[PDB]
Amino acid sequence: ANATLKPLCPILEQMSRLQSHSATSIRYIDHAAVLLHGLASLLGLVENGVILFVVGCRMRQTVVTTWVLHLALSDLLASASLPFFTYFLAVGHSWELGTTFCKLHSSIFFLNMFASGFLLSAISLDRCLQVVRPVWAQNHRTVAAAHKVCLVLWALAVLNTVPYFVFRDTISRLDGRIMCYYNVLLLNPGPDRDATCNSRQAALAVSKFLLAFLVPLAIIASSHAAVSLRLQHRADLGLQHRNIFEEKLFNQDVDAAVRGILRNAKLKPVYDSLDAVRRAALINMVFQMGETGVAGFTNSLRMLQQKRWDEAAVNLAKSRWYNQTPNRAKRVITTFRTGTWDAYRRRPGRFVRLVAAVVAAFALCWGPYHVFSLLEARAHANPGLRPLVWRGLPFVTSLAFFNSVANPVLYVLTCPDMLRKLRRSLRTVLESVLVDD
Numbered sequence: 001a002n003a004t005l006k007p008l009c010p011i012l013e014q015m016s017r018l019q020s021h022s023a024t025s026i027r028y029i030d031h032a033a034v035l036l037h038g039l040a041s042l043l044g045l046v047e048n049g050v051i052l053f054v055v056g057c058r059m060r061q062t063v064v065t066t067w068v069l070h071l072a073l074s075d076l077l078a079s080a081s082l083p084f085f086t087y088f089l090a091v092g093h094s095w096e097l098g099t100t101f102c103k104l105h106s107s108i109f110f111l112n113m114f115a116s117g118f119l120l121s122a123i124s125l126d127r128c129l130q131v132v133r134p135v136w137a138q139n140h141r142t143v144a145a146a147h148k149v150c151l152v153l154w155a156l157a158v159l160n161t162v163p164y165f166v167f168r169d170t171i172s173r174l175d176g177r178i179m180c181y182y183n184v185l186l187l188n189p190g191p192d193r194d195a196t197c198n199s200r201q202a203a204l205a206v207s208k209f210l211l212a213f214l215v216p217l218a219i220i221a222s223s224h225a226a227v228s229l230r231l232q233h234r235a236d237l238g239l240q241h242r243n244i245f246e247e248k249l250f251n252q253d254v255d256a257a258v259r260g261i262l263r264n265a266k267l268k269p270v271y272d273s274l275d276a277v278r279r280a281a282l283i284n285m286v287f288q289m290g291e292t293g294v295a296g297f298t299n300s301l302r303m304l305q306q307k308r309w310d311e312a313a314v315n316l317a318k319s320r321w322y323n324q325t326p327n328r329a330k331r332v333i334t335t336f337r338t339g340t341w342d343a344y345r346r347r348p349g350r351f352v353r354l355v356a357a358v359v360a361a362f363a364l365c366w367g368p369y370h371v372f373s374l375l376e377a378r379a380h381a382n383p384g385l386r387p388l389v390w391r392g393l394p395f396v397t398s399l400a401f402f403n404s405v406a407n408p409v410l411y412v413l414t415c416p417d418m419l420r421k422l423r424r425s426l427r428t429v430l431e432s433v434l435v436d437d
């Protein structure tokens with residue numbers, strides 16, 4: 001800037017010397033694109049806003065809803081960076097908002113990329129453990145954990161975007177335009193700049209393609225294949241006369257706990273004074289909070305041994321165990337009350353249409369982006385690709401942004417419960433005016 005020089009890579013040094021029009025500082029404005037992205041910015045913000053409200057405040061909080069919630073939060077952040085990308089187009093393709101903002105704005109785009117990929121993998125593996133490890137799932141699939149998993153994924157997402165925040169720099173074009181783009185040589189360049197430019201620009205493109213696209217889709221496909229075969233296998237068994245009403249990761253070792261239950265003085269008589277059905281609900285508690293924890297329930301165990309079911313339930317509903325993970329505790333409590341196994345219904349899964357649509361959208365929108373970015377890495381050696389990447393790369397990036405505008409629509413189209421609770425709240429907002437204004 002102020003009598004400072006910086007070494008640039010051939011790709012950017014050429015993008016800098018690219019003469020738009022004829023060396024005259026006059027900027028052409030594609031008014032069509034500006035309105036498109038600007039409208040997109042509006043839609044994306046409003047759409048993911050209402051989705052966060054419906055799922056968040058007007059919907060029964062489950063584990064699956066927790067994935068959709070974070071997935072729409074990322075799309076909201078993308079929708080929030082999109083306005084600044086429209087200004088970049090209105091100015092005439094130039095970054096006029098200092099250097100430090102060129103990093104944050106860009107990182108936001110990459111943050112939603114890693115986050116969306118990680119969450120979709122989590123949704124897949126969740127659906128897989130739901131089918132392949134039913135016993136372990138009904139004792140540990142709690143919305144509390146789902147929330148904790150999302151935070152770890154966000155931290156991992158914020159971590160893989162750190163490199164992109166660092167190497168984002170503002171490069172001045174000859175047009176008077178200011179670019180906001182990679183600056184591989186911004187810090188500790190190598191004695192062989194041609195190597196560092198090729199090396200780093202290729203490492204970023206591949207790691208991004210693996211962690212944020214290839215691996216997610218691999219996990220997604222693998223998970224889908226595993227559940228598909230298990231359901232094929234479960235259907236075969238059901239059509240046989242095997243309906244009598246019946247440690248390693250994601251375990252299911254019943255014999256192990258029964259030997260610890262009988263080894264505990266407080267639990268042995270309660271486990272002996274129980275029918276077959278209520279003995280299983282007691283083992284489920286041990287799986288969830290251990291024998292040391294279930295033994296803490298001094299007054300409530302007394303009720304179970306004495307067949308005082310309804311009275312025991314009141315006590316458990318007052319416990320922290322019920323007030324932190326109610327769904328799994330309600331399952332165990334009611335099982336003691338009724339003495340049947342209906343609470344563990346295990347009816348078919350929901351949100352299959354939703355998860356399928358979002359995965360398809362994720363694949364089509366981010367697929368093209370990663371294709372051109374890798375060509376960019378290969379275009380260092382092969383200059384013939386550079387002009388194709390120059391013009392073709394900005395279009396695939398706008399595609400990725402529009403994914404955050406389509407996901408909210410896919411949510412509603414493929415889930416009646418979603419559209420239904422949106423209308424009811426949309427009517428309450430249009431029904432207070434009518435009655436006794």
Ligand SMILES: CCCCC[C@@](C)(O)/C=C/[C@H]1C(=O)C[C@H](O)[C@@H]1C/C=C\CCCC(=O)O
Nearest residue numbers: 085088095106109179180181373393394397
């Ligand atoms: C982070 C994406 C949203 C930010 C957009 C913005 C303001 O950085 C403007 C960028 C443009 C330039 O500065 C030159 C170049 O034409 C570039 C447009 C083409 C692709 C976008 C980057 C893709 C990647 O990082 O792999």
Ligand code: NA
Nearest residue numbers: 071074075116
């Ligand atoms: Na997303």
